[PDB]
């Protein structure tokens, strides 16, 4: 019928584990789990045996880059945003003890980099 709405990283519906397909007018329990802001709501197969709108239900928070490297050199591999990663390179031939590569992840109401603080071995 619905042919399984799809896998949503945001949410792990209770019923979807062994069932996956439902009749029109059926409400599914979706929960936003790993820190996403969104207000969970059921997805109901209302249109064309397709779901009401499971899209962007749970939300990613915008990330930041004002912590800056001491040298002034930081590289944006993926982006500044959530799931993205950056380099903190002070020098080519030096070591950075802590988070050389900061990664922005969801804490729940905000997104932070896993960066402890700028570090330069030199």
Q: CATH no. for residue 53?
A: 2.10.70.10
My answer on whether 89 and 53 are in the same domain is no
Please give the tally of structural domains in the chain.
2
What whole-number distance in Å separates Cα of residue 94 and Cα of residue 122?
A: 5
My answer on whether 81 and 24 are in the same domain is no
How far lies 35's CA from each of 44, 96, 108, 109, 115, in Å? 24, 29, 4, 7, 18
My answer on whether 11 and 38 are in the same domain is yes
My answer on whether 67 and 114 are in the same domain is yes
Q: Both tokens of residue 32?
A: 């936003």
My answer on whether 64 and 54 are in the same domain is no
Q: Which of 37, 59, 81 is a domain's end point?
A: 59
What whole-number distance in Å separates Cα of residue 100 and Cα of residue 75?
A: 10
Its domain, for residue 120, covers: 60-122
Q: Both tokens of residue 72?
A: 């002034």
What whole-number distance in Å separates Cα of residue 68 and Cα of residue 91?
A: 14
How far lies 74's CA from each of 6, 63, 79, 101, in Å? 37, 15, 11, 9
Experimental approach was NMR
Secondary structure (3-state) at 75 = strand
My answer on whether 1 and 55 are in the same domain is yes
My answer on whether 2 and 55 are in the same domain is yes
């Amino acid at each position: 019928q619905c042919n399984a709405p799809e896998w949503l990283p945001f949410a792990r519906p209770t019923q979807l584990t062994d069932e996956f397909e439902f009749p029109i007018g059926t409400y599914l329990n979706y929960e936003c789990r790993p820190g996403y802001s969104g207000r969970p709501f059921s997805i109901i197969c209302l249109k064309n045996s397709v779901w009401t709108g499971a899209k962007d239900r749970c939300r990613r928070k915008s990330c930041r880059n004002p912590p800056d490297p001491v040298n002034g050199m930081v590289h944006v591999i993926k982006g500044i945003q959530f799931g993205s990663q950056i380099k903190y390179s002070c020098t080519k031939g030096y070591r950075l003890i802590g988070s050389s590569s900061a990664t922005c992840i969801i804490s729940g109401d905000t997104v932070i980099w896993d960066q402890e603080t700028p570090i330069c071995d030199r």
